[PDB]
Amino acid sequence: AAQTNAPWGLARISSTSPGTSTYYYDESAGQGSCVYVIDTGIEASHPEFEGRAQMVKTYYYSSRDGNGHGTHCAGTVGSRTYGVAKKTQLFGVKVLDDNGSGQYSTIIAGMDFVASDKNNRNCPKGVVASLSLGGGYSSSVNSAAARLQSSGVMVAVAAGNNNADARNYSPASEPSVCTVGASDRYDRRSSFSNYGSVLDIFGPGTDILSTWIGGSTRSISGTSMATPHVAGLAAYLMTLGKTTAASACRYIADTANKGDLSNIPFGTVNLLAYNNYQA
Numbered sequence: 001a002a003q004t005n006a007p008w009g010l011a012r013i014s015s016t017s018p019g020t021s022t023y024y025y026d027e028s029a030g031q032g033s034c035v036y037v038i039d040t041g042i043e044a045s046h047p048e049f050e051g052r053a054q055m056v057k058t059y060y061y062s063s064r065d066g067n068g069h070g071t072h073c074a075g076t077v078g079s080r081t082y083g084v085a086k087k088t089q090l091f092g093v094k095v096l097d098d099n100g101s102g103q104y105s106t107i108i109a110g111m112d113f114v115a116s117d118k119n120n121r122n123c124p125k126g127v128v129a130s131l132s133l134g135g136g137y138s139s140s141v142n143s144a145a146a147r148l149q150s151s152g153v154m155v156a157v158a159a160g161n162n163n164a165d166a167r168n169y170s171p172a173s174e175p176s177v178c179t180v181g182a183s184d185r186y187d188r189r190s191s192f193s194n195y196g197s198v199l200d201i202f203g204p205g206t207d208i209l210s211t212w213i214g215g216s217t218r219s220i221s222g223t224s225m226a227t228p229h230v231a232g233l234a235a236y237l238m239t240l241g242k243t244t245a246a247s248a249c250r251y252i253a254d255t256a257n258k259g260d261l262s263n264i265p266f267g268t269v270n271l272l273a274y275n276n277y278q279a
């Protein structure tokens with residue numbers, strides 16, 4: 001399948017070269033997979049989600065996304081127009097308040113929630129979790145991300161936006177999950193993207209158009225935006241049968257575009273997520 005005039009990041013993940021605007025993907029589109037978006041919530045009523053999104057957990061007085069960030073990330077995973085995996089099921093877990101903040105204990109509870117809650121959902125092709133959040137290093141946060149991965153969920157986490165080594169941030173620094181840096185439309189590392197040996201992959205992260213609250217759309221930037229490209233890619237590849245939750249990060253790294261990004265520090269991988277789709 002082909003989606004013309006797609007957001008540049010969707011085109012980029014299905015291309016061997018920058019500078020194109022059509023997204024190419026197998027029409028299965030992540031059907032039968034599930035992606036949890038652990039964030040500020042999801043505006044599930046947005047027409048772009050087509051009834052495929054639902055809130056399953058909140059730690060606050062409401063499950064509504066009063067911020068927009070979670071809705072934007074969910075849109076990059078799986079919205080009809082802005083999403084990688086246009087037929088996946090999306091599950092929202094609100095661990096961040098409407099200011100985008102949350103304590104580590106709540107984030108840990110949300111990860112352990114997903115590890116259990118996946119057993120209440122129908123996800124025959126596999127389960128992914130997208131974590132576009134982070135803070136300073138915490139062994140407890142890293143352990144929670146490691147548990148979620150071990151339970152059979154492909155965990156994708158943002159590297160962070162400090163132009164610094166991601167080893168000092170969590171859950172970015174957990175080795176067993178998939179840590180995602182950000183690139184721009186000219187194949188440069190995004191200026192704010194963290195780096196380091198703990199990174200596994202880069203995805204599009206600068207000027208990413210996706211869904212927003214109020215039934216709207218907007219373009220924003222961050223490793224938060226790169227992470228759901230990788231999460232949606234994992235769901236898409238799992239539906240195709242090419243990989244599993246335990247192996248998807250390695251598979252994405254194996255099949256990535258290699259050596260194409262500029263301003264990658266020595267010792268950080270030069271790997272850009274790629275769906276390897278041949279129409």
Ligand SMILES: C[C@H](NC(=O)CCC(=O)c1cccs1)c1cccnc1
Pocket residue numbers: 069099100101102103104107132133134135136224
């Ligand atoms: C993730 C980032 N802001 C945070 O304050 C970190 C949230 C978090 O996990 C914390 C780590 C240490 C104290 S709290 C963010 C994400 C989305 C929207 N706006 C901001």
